[model samples]
Target: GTSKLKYVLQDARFFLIKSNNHENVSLAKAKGVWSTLPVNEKKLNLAFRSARSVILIFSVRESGKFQGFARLSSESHHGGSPIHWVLPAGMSAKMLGGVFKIDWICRRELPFTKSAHLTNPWNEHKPVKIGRDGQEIELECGTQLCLLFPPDESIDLYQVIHKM
Candidate 1:
């Protein structure tokens, strides 16, 4: 038997990119962009079964700082990295990094989530892979995926345990 999980769409925000060597800044609004599950579960399996990796992007309100960590796990392996805020507290929105991108999954059978198709003026086609592992997998740049964050009132410290 398979356990059923509920997924929901939260809010969408605008991702603006300032071009280098150019004075124009491009703007695009991402709709239906949200996390599929809360940040307390052990795994977030994607809808596709043949996914090899999942990419995660975190964007906080311009007023708040990024202060969270994300972990990737599978049936046999696990790894993760701490998420750092692009700007310090009490700083202006312009001081914040325009965007942050991270590749979460590098293998299969791990806790993961499906990514929504991103559409913007820069591109005309969706960048989603729909096939098995190591076969017919398409990779693209500027691709974004949903992120899982810790639940409210969760501890704000990282603890490590070692045994031999």
Candidate 2:
């Protein structure tokens, strides 16, 4: 197995929700776990209210030969929310001040006493509020490479839901 993990982070994506709009744009919301939902703003809004539909339209950041954009948002609560992502890019994760990045990501599956190790207590079938953002197949490594991202919540046109 590869004994090092310290390059991909630089190649990894850094996202910003370039610009967004609050609308009733038509989008098909499917079931199951999805972190980000992308919608085209220029598209006309013509959907049934049955979708619990309130479109947050925006574009993702295009950087370093990027492909997509950052869209949709919520409160800035740590360790949980809309999505969870993990990468085994390196031994240390970088924190870009206010930029958002997922915490607690390890490459190895089981513990190893070798050069590169993936720690335990990480279950695939389980629900980790922050790990997956909250994933699949095999190919596993160790250690917590905590890379932090931007925590800015200023630009998103947010709506508040009533909580108990």
Candidate 3:
């Protein structure tokens, strides 16, 4: 296993959100998570709405790259209305940070690849869970390597969800 990234803060919570065509990078600039249904952004909105700040890793579904991550936070308490999240990248409260330079875990980690790390906790059984909807896969600093790959001799759909 490789050493964890320096920006990986201890006791900090993290979540993985799959993206397409490098949408993560663009979304950081866009400064929002637009959605149609309230349920669509339920977990995602809750993650940011409830915590002071949370890290969001955008795994590009079309590429092996993890793309980037952002520290999402919200100042106001959202009560079933639109969520105004503060998306800052990196290990802080106001910036979009980069990921490991060579964080490749084979093509299998990609959605279109042989075996992608697919998780549909939203009750959607689609290949790419975050494609049609913004489904968040929760993560912690624990099992850093296994977070990318399945545990030894075992496989589960809820990779990060198990962490929760």
Candidate 4:
């Protein structure tokens, strides 16, 4: 006797449509989980439709470096669309008031490395945002470190997502 093994998989799809006269661009439909973000990671997934192209911005924050900022440009493989910047060390909690700028090329680039700086505490730990023509989406700190874990415990090598 013989037996047959069977396997099944599931997937989702999204579609984009443009008008014939170039007057409007619309997302035909979005199915499945376009963006699944954990609550504690302070992650954001935004989708924007422009006359030219569709843009998606995803961002998250984790412990790293001694408070610095970085940026990337279009030429860089990870530079064009999803531009990202990080705040400097010892500043994340202090400079919660400073403004940050993010530049994008075509809107398809993912995980672009942008500008970074090691500076004073007051100017460190800047915020990140995504926008077009001034409309923007801002990422706020979701899970507080001191509240969730012991101060003496090292969060350095720990993946923030798992801990969250």
Candidate 5:
């Protein structure tokens, strides 16, 4: 049997710091502990694989605004940039100049305002559509915000690690 570790990812979430100009290198590593340590490759891989969309969030220093989003595509655990994304039409490269992890890109305006998506709740069992009816809101930077749309499936992080 092959001993090399293999990870299976379907729907996932990742956080990225958005920029206004060229791809921001430091902003890509904004995840703090998750970004600093190499031992946590498992965590990084998991979050990276579970990606479907990319959210380029701005910090308070930059007026704290939700810039925009795009489809996520082409991500990897072992690589240089780790991800590539496609920007929506009318959106500029200036809006997507940071290290990001995504597998596809779409052209839809961020459907909700800053506070709107934050308060709502999304249930997998329910028949609600994301970015249409409600969304899995995010809190602060590097929090739960971006999600891969594969129609309602979830896995507990501890549950997966426990099996290991």
Candidate 6:
């Protein structure tokens, strides 16, 4: 049998750019972890999976592999320059130069800002009907691993190995 922990693979459709352009990959590894030290990076990797921050998690597992690492994002979308994020402690990173090269981008799967969807399940330009009935909007999802978030609040992020 296959392991659920190995790949949070989702067969998806992708729309890239201006419009009328899209493609469907065999499998979209939205969030997945394939490792050499195969024991179970589940709980942690799973947490990293549920987390949607752009702040990536680069790790050196206790299994002893310098190249071993995983990704994790912060709330409200992860991955971008470090202008707002000055490298936090406990993680290490490197940079050379380039257009796509962000100041900080070890980042994992980030949560899409569904704050708008919280109030109304429609786009801003094309909004759906929903009125304020005094009750704040709250949304939760995921079958096994659940994610709960507020209607407007933002921010959250990473962690990985050791105390050397």
Which candidate tops lDDT? Answer: 3
Q: How many steric overlaps are in each model, in order?
A: 1, 22, 5, 16, 10, 13
Q: How well does candidate 1 score on lDDT at residue 52?
A: 31
The sequence of per-residue lDDT tens digits that candidate 2 reaches over residues 1-164 is: 11122222222222212212111010111111112221311111122111222222122222111111122222122343332223123311122111122221121112112212322235442321112211111112111221111222332212211110
lDDT of 3 by residue, 12-114 (tens): 4455555444543554435433222334345555665554335555565556545444444332222343323333242232212212111112112322342
Candidate models: Cα lDDT each = 0.23, 0.20, 0.38, 0.19, 0.30, 0.20
Tell me the spans in candidate 2 whose CA falls farther than 4 Å from its real position.
1-64, 79-84, 91-164
Give the range of the ten consecutive residues with the poorest summed lDDT in model 3: 98-107
Q: Per-residue lDDT for 148 in model 1?
A: 26
Clashing pairs in 5: 12-50, 23-97, 71-104, 71-105, 72-102, 72-103, 72-104, 73-102, 73-103, 73-104
Worst 10-residue lDDT window, candidate 4: 1-10
* RMSD to the hidden true structure, all candidates: 17.3, 18.5, 11.8, 20.9, 13.4, 18.0
Higher-TM-score candidate among 3 and 4? Answer: 3
Q: Give the TM-score of candidate 6.
A: 0.16
Candidates 4 and 5 compared by lDDT, better number: 5
Candidate 1 stretches with Cα past 4 Å from truth are 1-44, 63-71, 75-139, 143-164
Q: Write the per-residue lDDT of candidate 5 for residues 14-35, one digit (tens) a residue.
A: 3333333323323333321112
Which residue pairs overlap in candidate 1's backbone? 44-112
Stretches of candidate 6 off by over 4 Å are 1-36, 54-164
Whole-model alpha-carbon lDDT for candidate 2: 0.20
- In model 3, what are the clashing residue pairs, if there are any? 88-95, 89-95, 89-96, 89-97, 90-97
Please estimate how well model 5 matches the true structure, expressed as its whole-model Cα lDDT. 0.30
Q: What is the lDDT of residue 19 in candidate 5?
A: 38
Ranking by TM-score: 3, 5, 1, 4, 2, 6
Ranking of all predicted structures according to lDDT, beginning with the best and ending with the worst: 3, 5, 1, 2, 6, 4
Candidate 4 local lDDT, 94-132, one digit each (tens): 222222221221122122122122111222344222211
* Candidate 4: regions farther than 4 A off: 1-33, 36-49, 63-113, 117-164
Which structure among the candidates has the greatest TM-score?
3
